[PDB]
Each structure stands twice: as structure tokens, then as C-alpha cells.
Amino acid sequence: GMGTDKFNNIKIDKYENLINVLKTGDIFLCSGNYLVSKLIKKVSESMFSHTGIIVKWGEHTLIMESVEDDGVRIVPLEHYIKNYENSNNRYNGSLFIARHELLQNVNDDSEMIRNLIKVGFSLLNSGYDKNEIAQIVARIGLGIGRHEDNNEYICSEFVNECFKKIGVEFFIFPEHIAADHHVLPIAQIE
Amino acid sequence: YFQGMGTDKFNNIKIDKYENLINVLKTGDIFLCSGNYLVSKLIKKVSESMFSHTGIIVKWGEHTLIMESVEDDGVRIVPLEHYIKNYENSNNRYNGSLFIARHELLQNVNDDSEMIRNLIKVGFSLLNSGYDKNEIAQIVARIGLGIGRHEDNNEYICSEFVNECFKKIGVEFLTDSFIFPEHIAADHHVLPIAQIE
Amino acid sequence: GTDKFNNIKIDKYENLINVLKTGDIFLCSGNYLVSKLIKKVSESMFSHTGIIVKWGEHTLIMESVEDDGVRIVPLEHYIKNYENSNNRYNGSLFIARHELLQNVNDDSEMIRNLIKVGFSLLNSGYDKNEIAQIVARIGLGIGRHEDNNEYICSEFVNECFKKIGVEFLFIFPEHIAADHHVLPIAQIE
Amino acid sequence: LYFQGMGTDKFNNIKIDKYENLINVLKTGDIFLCSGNYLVSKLIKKVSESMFSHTGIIVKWGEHTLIMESVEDDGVRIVPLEHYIKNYENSNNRYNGSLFIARHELLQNVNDDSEMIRNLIKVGFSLLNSGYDKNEIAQIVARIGLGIGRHEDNNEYICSEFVNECFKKIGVEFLTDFIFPEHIAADHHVLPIAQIE
Ligand SMILES: N[C@@H](CCCC[NH3+])C(=O)O
Ligand SMILES: N[C@@H](CCCC[NH3+])C(=O)O
Ligand SMILES: N[C@@H](CCCC[NH3+])C(=O)O
Ligand SMILES: N[C@@H](CCCC[NH3+])C(=O)O
Ligand SMILES: [Cl-]
Ligand SMILES: [Cl-]
Ligand SMILES: [Cl-]
Ligand SMILES: [Cl-]
Ligand SMILES: [Cl-]
Ligand SMILES: [Cl-]
Ligand SMILES: [Cl-]
Ligand SMILES: [Cl-]
Ligand SMILES: [Cl-]
């Protein structure tokens, strides 16, 4: 899909260097090799299987996200690099950062960034139960979107709720976020 | 709409009340369901079938159990009563329709035959203590991708489990696709008995 | 008490299969944290109990496992693959038989009703909240509400027998082991 | 009242503030304390002879107030404090118990983006998990009842063990001669701020 090309020749930065460039609200994107990742890639015809939102606590970099075999969580980006989901190894796939055009000239303690984070925090849960994981992965394969205030989210549905509730509009897969004319690539992580 | 031979085979089958069927059921009978759960629909879509689930009936005396892999749960054995009155701790009937069939080879075989003993042995040997979150995701993903179980692993789609049990007593199912419930329903040796009212 | 099982004959699992009868009482002395909490609060070597159910020649154990659920599974799991570990249950294992069911055949009405009640309580796993509640009740020594379907192992074994008339003298495995009508058969080698 | 320790009197006549008013007074690092009526809460209260069953660390994201904690039937999580007031663990109701705020003496004259506060938060974040499994919940509650601390470099934490790891890694030790909420409440450097109305 047209998000493919947009990231194909983006600069490759080492993780240590990128820390200083990342801003709260930046959009994390991944192309994973996990079975669930592959289902997302097939149904959406994309190289992108995951998305989430970056949140800086001081100098510390966290990723706020819905991970479909896990939950709506907030965790250190370092996990994707060094210990993905208790494997003690790097995420199996490639990793990218982008930034939304509207938030590029907005400081980390702006009103907008505050409300974006607020909404994400409000959706943090304590893991999905077995039933819900099954339901979420099934909706991906069926291409079906979710009920009004049902709280089970595909990664991109979660990124979408947060931006929705600050006005930025984008079913919805990671591809739709990557392909969006207002989403600007920053880097692939080496 | 968009469905196969298994479907017609069960379309005008006699409707029995659960209480009446109990006496007709025999260990090795094949349970079949057409569910409305998201995972049930994914199964129905990818396999182009009304059937989302299958399992093997086991009679302990007068009591009727169902041995099965339930993809959001585990490889378990539980009372058939659950599907009628209390499906997965919901206190309500399974959201879908229910059917019973019998394999031709086991129709003239008594419940303590050596075949039925081996069928039950294998099923018992695969019961687990639930699938972990990772495994449930992987199973449901395979369904959507139409990939069979490609390492020597113990994660089973409902029909895969039923198939392993029968495989290990010499009954093979035309598993052309991988194997979904449809291939069990559609199999020439599988005869319909009833829909449960 | 404890002593009742101390010098009981040690049988190999393969040999015991033929001796077991539906309704036999399974007993364990485990080294798991939850096992030890049961052993402490009840001052006993017994951490677990359950009811044996024979499907033809095959041997199942019907039980409430406090970090899992009210389930029925092959006894073979306790010997070879306890709770997806691919190893034997970390502890020792015993069989007893209740005096009343010794002269009663496997398809008697009593055995039928014992199995009926146990089947009626099988669930699809305990939720996280319920496990915590069960383990907390063990440590607090509190029994359960008559509505509540959350069971300490021994509370489950007790309900089954209660509904066929057999009463046991809150309730931990120790009370079942110690009961004058529960006779030891074997420790599993 | 005689079945209980020094931690208790320290919080008995503390001012009662409405939640809305306390938001402005709270600072990252402040210690949350609860006296719950849940079964697990009672086991904690008995074994530790305390009115306190829970503890956690407050973390401010701008004006929004979060609580970072290990909840023993759930996980090492970070969630809005508002949940304790309006929707505790999906019940849509307030936490069943009483709630308190305290502040450590060392952090009273330290601003919210200090280097210390940064490291406290770093450690907490590093321990956030995706829920405890059924096995671990059982193990944790068992340890509480057995009064045993965590032997290996093990990641299963009683609430106060979590609060203790975060403070330990910025130099603040709590008289842990195992550790329950009581030892945090009773600590001479922990000053009561308010009970939440
Ligand atoms: N959407 C997620 C799926 C996670 C699979 C492994 N936990 C990703 O592609 O990263
Ligand atoms: N194969 C199963 C899927 C599980 C749906 C609910 N747990 C069925 O169609 O019943
Ligand atoms: N009563 C049980 C406790 C659960 C052990 C962990 N699965 C036993 O001693 O075996
Ligand atoms: N430490 C916790 C115990 C578990 C509460 C159950 N939701 C508390 O007292 O709040
Ligand atoms: Cl995978
Ligand atoms: Cl960090
Ligand atoms: Cl991770
Ligand atoms: Cl569903
Ligand atoms: Cl069920
Ligand atoms: Cl343990
Ligand atoms: Cl087991
Ligand atoms: Cl409770
Ligand atoms: Cl909560």
C-alpha cells in the first residue's frame, strides 16, 4: 500500500540518537513477523502490523498502545529494542517513527498533548482477558470494526481514539495511519 | 448464501429436545455447532460453511460430556449440558445452533469397544489446562491466515483436535484445505442424527 | 491423621489403575506456595484432595484446583505433566476409599449421583479475582457463602459427598484424610 | 484497635479532603495508602496487624493524577487515581475501603521534574507488566498468608514490595525487618497528608 513507499528510503537512526528527537504524540509504527502481525498485514495489504503513541516522561521514552495479544498498556520503548514481551530479545520486525503535521509545532506540555495523553491513560486496562484477545484477532481477520463504547481495540483503533478526541480524524488499520497525508516519517530504528 | 455440501446435509434434519437426545448419544458421536461469536464467524468465513465448531461426545455412564478444543479457552472436557444452559460461565445457552452426527464406522461399535477406548485415550492425552494469551492469538490468527499447525505444537483448532483423535484410530478426514468443521460435516462417512431444539 | 498414611504400601501407577474405583479420594502433599499455605493453616501434610472417576479403563480426577478451576482431567497428568509443566506433580500422592462406597459397583446409583454433582460444578476456569479470593479464604480460615461457587479443593470433594448423604467431620484436606471412614489404599510410587 | 500498630494512630485524625481539592496538593512520589474490605485486603490486614491493605505511588502527568502500583489480583499497573474514586476495577463504583495520601520527608522539597523523581518513575515503569497470570496471583496471595518474602530476583510483588523497590533504587530504604503497607505507613519519614472523603 501507499504507506509502503512513504517509509522505504527513510533515514536509519540508532535508538540512542533518536531518544532526543522523539516528542510526545509521535506515532510508532512496526512491521512484525508474528502470526497476528501477518494477519494484519494480509487483511490490510500493508507492511505495517502495529502502531502506538510515544509519550516522554522527562528524558524517558514510553510507548502507549493496544497490543492485541496483551492489553492497552504503557511501557518503555526500550522493550521493543531489548526485551519484547518477556523474550529478552528485540521485537521481531522493523520499527519506525512518524509525526503528525498538526503536532509538529506544539510543545510537550501543550493543551493538545495533555488531552491526547489523558484519553490514552483513560483506556489503559489490566490486560485483555482470553475471550477478548480472541475477539480482537477475529475482528482483524473479519475486517469488522467495533461497537460504540466496547473497549477492545486493534492497535490502530486505539491510536485513532486518542487522536479522535483531540479533533484529528484519520475500520482502521495501521496502513491508514501510515498512509495519511499528515503523517510524516522521521526514522527507521536501526 | 456462500456455503457447501455440509450445509445441505444438515438442513432438514429432525429437531430433538436435549432430554430426549441423551439416550441416543454414543461416545464418539461428533458435535457440530454454528455459532454467532466473532471467532465463530471467522471460521465460517474462511471455510465457507455454516459450521464453526466440532467436538467428540463422551458418555460417562448416563452423563454426557463433550471433549473439544475451544479456541479462546483450551483443550477441555465438559458437560454437554453447558452448551444448553451455561456456555462459558454466561449462564445462558450457546449463541448458535447445535447438531449431532455419527461416523459410519462407529455405528456398530459398543461404548467399551477397544476403538472407543483408544479414541478417548488420545483425547485425554491432549487435554490441557487452558491456552495462554499468546496461544489464543496464534490459533485465531492461523484460522484467519488458513495456515495449519506447522511446528510439532499442541495448539488446536476445534476440527484439528477432532481429527487427531480419529486419525489415531485409523479414521482420516478429507483434510484438503488444514481441516475445518466443514470437512467433518461434509465427509461421506459422517451421518447426521439431529439438531438440538 | 498424618499417621494414617505414614506406612502405607507404595504402588507403581501402572499397577494401581486396576485397583482404583470411581469415588476413591485422591490426596496430595504438595510443595507449591498455595500447598504450603494449606498445610500451615490446617497443620497437615495434605494440601490437596479430589475424587477419582473411571471412564472404562481410563482414570480421571475431578477436582477444584485453587489457581485454576473446577476441572476434570487425567490422573496421568499428576504423574507425567502437571499443569502444562511436562513433569510430575511436585509432591506426594495418595489414594483412599470411603468405607460406604467400598461394596458399591461403579454404576450404582450412589456413584451416579456423586458424579452428577461434580459434573454440575465443573466450570471453565476461575477468574483472577476468584483465585485471589480462594487463596485469601485459605489464609483467613474463612468458609464460603452457600451461593458462592468458588471452592477450596476439599470444599468441592465435600459438596459432592454431601449431596449423597456422606458428611465429613470450614474444611481442609486434613479433615477428609483424618475421617474414621476414609481408608488408605496406596501411595503412588 | 489493640490488634494493630503505630501506623494506625498516625492516620486516625488526619484531615478529610474532597478528591477535587486534593488533586492540586498531590505531588509525584506521594504515597497512596488504602484500607480495603476485600478478602485479599483482609489477609494483608491480619498477617500484618494493620488497618492498611494497600499502597502505591502517585504520578502526575501534567494536571492528571495517576497511581502506579502492584495490585495482587491484577498486575503491576499505572492507572488514573479517579478509578479508586469512581470505578474500581471495572465495578463502576468507588473502592470498597478508605483512602489516604502521605508524602515522604525527603521528597517534600523536590520539584516534580527533579532527577530523583525521574529515577523513581523510571524504576516503576521498568516493572510495569501486562497483568499477573493465574499462577502468579495464587503465588502472591500465598506468600502474604505465609509471611514469606520474594526469594529469587522474582517479578511478583506484594503492593508494598513494589513501592519499596521504587524507593530502594533512589536510596530511600523502609524498615523492612519482608514488607507490608504498615511498615510504609509507620515509617518516621512518611508524613500523612489526608484521608480522601
Ligand atoms: N499489532 C501487534 C501484534 C503483536 C504480536 C506479538 N505480541 C504487532 O504487530 O506488533
Ligand atoms: N470454534 C468455536 C469458537 C469459540 C467461540 C466462543 N468461545 C465455536 O464456534 O464455538
Ligand atoms: N491444593 C493444591 C494447590 C494448588 C497447587 C498449584 N497448582 C495442591 O496442593 O496441589
Ligand atoms: N492490596 C490490595 C489487595 C487486593 C484488592 C482487590 N481488588 C488492596 O488492599 O487494595
Ligand atoms: Cl506468533
Ligand atoms: Cl527509560
Ligand atoms: Cl514488551
Ligand atoms: Cl464474540
Ligand atoms: Cl462451557
Ligand atoms: Cl508455587
Ligand atoms: Cl494438570
Ligand atoms: Cl473480595
Ligand atoms: Cl481500577
mmCIF file of C-alpha atoms in Angstrom, chain D residues 25-143:
data_model
loop_
_atom_site.group_PDB
_atom_site.id
_atom_site.type_symbol
_atom_site.label_atom_id
_atom_site.label_comp_id
_atom_site.label_asym_id
_atom_site.label_seq_id
_atom_site.Cartn_x
_atom_site.Cartn_y
_atom_site.Cartn_z
ATOM 1 C CA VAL D 25 -1.927 19.246 46.614
ATOM 2 C CA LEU D 26 -0.656 15.888 45.275
ATOM 3 C CA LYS D 27 2.912 15.575 44.000
ATOM 4 C CA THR D 28 4.586 12.776 42.076
ATOM 5 C CA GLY D 29 6.139 10.419 44.614
ATOM 6 C CA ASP D 30 3.367 10.794 47.151
ATOM 7 C CA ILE D 31 2.359 7.541 48.764
ATOM 8 C CA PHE D 32 -1.156 6.201 48.373
ATOM 9 C CA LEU D 33 -2.493 4.019 51.153
ATOM 10 C CA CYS D 34 -5.768 2.130 51.424
ATOM 11 C CA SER D 35 -7.626 0.118 53.974
ATOM 12 C CA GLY D 36 -9.768 -2.250 51.926
ATOM 13 C CA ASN D 37 -12.585 -4.647 52.759
ATOM 14 C CA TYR D 38 -11.748 -7.177 50.022
ATOM 15 C CA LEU D 39 -10.743 -10.706 51.100
ATOM 16 C CA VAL D 40 -7.142 -10.193 49.945
ATOM 17 C CA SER D 41 -7.179 -6.850 51.814
ATOM 18 C CA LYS D 42 -8.249 -8.625 54.999
ATOM 19 C CA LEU D 43 -5.480 -11.235 54.633
ATOM 20 C CA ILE D 44 -2.962 -8.401 54.342
ATOM 21 C CA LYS D 45 -4.523 -6.690 57.387
ATOM 22 C CA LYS D 46 -4.409 -9.835 59.534
ATOM 23 C CA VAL D 47 -0.938 -11.051 58.745
ATOM 24 C CA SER D 48 0.480 -7.536 59.187
ATOM 25 C CA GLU D 49 -1.757 -6.445 62.116
ATOM 26 C CA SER D 50 -2.599 -3.170 60.372
ATOM 27 C CA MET D 51 -5.553 -1.227 59.024
ATOM 28 C CA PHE D 52 -3.568 -0.807 55.796
ATOM 29 C CA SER D 53 -4.062 -3.294 52.955
ATOM 30 C CA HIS D 54 -2.619 -1.383 50.032
ATOM 31 C CA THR D 55 0.000 1.071 48.912
ATOM 32 C CA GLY D 56 1.110 2.689 45.651
ATOM 33 C CA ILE D 57 2.966 5.721 44.250
ATOM 34 C CA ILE D 58 1.276 8.805 42.839
ATOM 35 C CA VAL D 59 2.483 10.060 39.451
ATOM 36 C CA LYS D 60 1.295 13.386 37.977
ATOM 37 C CA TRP D 61 1.053 13.713 34.141
ATOM 38 C CA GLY D 62 0.515 17.471 33.887
ATOM 39 C CA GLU D 63 -2.657 18.139 35.878
ATOM 40 C CA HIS D 64 -3.807 14.438 35.561
ATOM 41 C CA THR D 65 -3.226 12.169 38.553
ATOM 42 C CA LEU D 66 -2.187 8.554 38.122
ATOM 43 C CA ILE D 67 -1.397 5.757 40.579
ATOM 44 C CA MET D 68 1.470 3.309 39.945
ATOM 45 C CA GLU D 69 1.081 0.052 41.877
ATOM 46 C CA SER D 70 1.166 -3.729 42.097
ATOM 47 C CA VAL D 71 -2.391 -4.929 42.736
ATOM 48 C CA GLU D 72 -2.160 -8.553 43.774
ATOM 49 C CA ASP D 73 -5.216 -9.900 41.895
ATOM 50 C CA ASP D 74 -4.346 -7.908 38.764
ATOM 51 C CA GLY D 75 -0.817 -6.697 37.922
ATOM 52 C CA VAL D 76 1.898 -4.065 38.111
ATOM 53 C CA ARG D 77 -0.050 -1.216 36.519
ATOM 54 C CA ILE D 78 -0.392 2.549 36.277
ATOM 55 C CA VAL D 79 -3.941 3.916 36.160
ATOM 56 C CA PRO D 80 -5.867 7.076 36.948
ATOM 57 C CA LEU D 81 -6.472 7.723 40.658
ATOM 58 C CA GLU D 82 -10.015 8.615 39.562
ATOM 59 C CA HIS D 83 -10.661 4.790 39.265
ATOM 60 C CA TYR D 84 -10.350 4.366 43.063
ATOM 61 C CA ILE D 85 -12.963 7.132 43.480
ATOM 62 C CA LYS D 86 -15.491 6.244 40.687
ATOM 63 C CA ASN D 87 -14.737 2.846 39.027
ATOM 64 C CA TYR D 88 -12.523 0.454 40.945
ATOM 65 C CA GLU D 89 -11.514 -2.486 38.800
ATOM 66 C CA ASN D 90 -14.461 -2.223 36.357
ATOM 67 C CA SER D 91 -17.114 -2.286 39.121
ATOM 68 C CA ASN D 92 -18.251 1.267 38.222
ATOM 69 C CA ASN D 93 -18.126 2.028 41.954
ATOM 70 C CA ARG D 94 -15.714 3.504 44.457
ATOM 71 C CA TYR D 95 -13.014 1.357 46.065
ATOM 72 C CA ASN D 96 -14.555 -0.548 48.991
ATOM 73 C CA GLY D 97 -12.402 0.877 51.794
ATOM 74 C CA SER D 98 -10.778 4.124 52.866
ATOM 75 C CA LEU D 99 -8.055 6.026 51.052
ATOM 76 C CA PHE D 100 -5.164 8.135 52.283
ATOM 77 C CA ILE D 101 -2.275 10.159 50.975
ATOM 78 C CA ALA D 102 1.152 10.543 52.523
ATOM 79 C CA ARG D 103 4.439 12.128 51.481
ATOM 80 C CA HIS D 104 7.986 11.073 52.194
ATOM 81 C CA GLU D 105 10.074 13.684 54.073
ATOM 82 C CA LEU D 106 12.981 13.572 51.583
ATOM 83 C CA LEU D 107 10.775 14.382 48.580
ATOM 84 C CA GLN D 108 8.865 17.289 50.166
ATOM 85 C CA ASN D 109 11.325 19.940 48.892
ATOM 86 C CA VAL D 110 11.949 18.360 45.498
ATOM 87 C CA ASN D 111 10.134 19.523 42.325
ATOM 88 C CA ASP D 112 8.201 17.188 40.030
ATOM 89 C CA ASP D 113 10.918 17.085 37.305
ATOM 90 C CA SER D 114 13.828 16.607 39.702
ATOM 91 C CA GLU D 115 16.358 13.932 38.853
ATOM 92 C CA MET D 116 15.161 11.863 41.883
ATOM 93 C CA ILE D 117 11.510 11.851 40.878
ATOM 94 C CA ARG D 118 12.675 10.885 37.330
ATOM 95 C CA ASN D 119 14.517 7.788 38.635
ATOM 96 C CA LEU D 120 11.696 6.765 40.956
ATOM 97 C CA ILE D 121 9.341 6.795 37.971
ATOM 98 C CA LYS D 122 11.904 5.068 35.705
ATOM 99 C CA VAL D 123 12.058 2.059 38.054
ATOM 100 C CA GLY D 124 8.279 1.831 38.330
ATOM 101 C CA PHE D 125 7.898 1.974 34.570
ATOM 102 C CA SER D 126 10.537 -0.729 34.154
ATOM 103 C CA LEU D 127 8.428 -3.051 36.323
ATOM 104 C CA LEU D 128 5.027 -2.458 34.688
ATOM 105 C CA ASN D 129 3.764 -5.798 33.333
ATOM 106 C CA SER D 130 0.784 -6.873 31.312
ATOM 107 C CA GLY D 131 -1.130 -8.403 34.244
ATOM 108 C CA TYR D 132 -0.154 -11.271 36.504
ATOM 109 C CA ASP D 133 -1.028 -14.796 35.332
ATOM 110 C CA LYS D 134 -3.403 -17.024 37.382
ATOM 111 C CA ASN D 135 -0.384 -18.939 38.812
ATOM 112 C CA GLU D 136 1.345 -15.759 39.984
ATOM 113 C CA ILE D 137 -1.754 -14.317 41.641
ATOM 114 C CA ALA D 138 -2.087 -17.549 43.605
ATOM 115 C CA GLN D 139 1.648 -17.412 44.474
ATOM 116 C CA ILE D 140 1.492 -13.777 45.628
ATOM 117 C CA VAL D 141 -1.585 -14.233 47.845
ATOM 118 C CA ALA D 142 0.008 -17.415 49.224
ATOM 119 C CA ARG D 143 3.205 -15.519 50.140
#
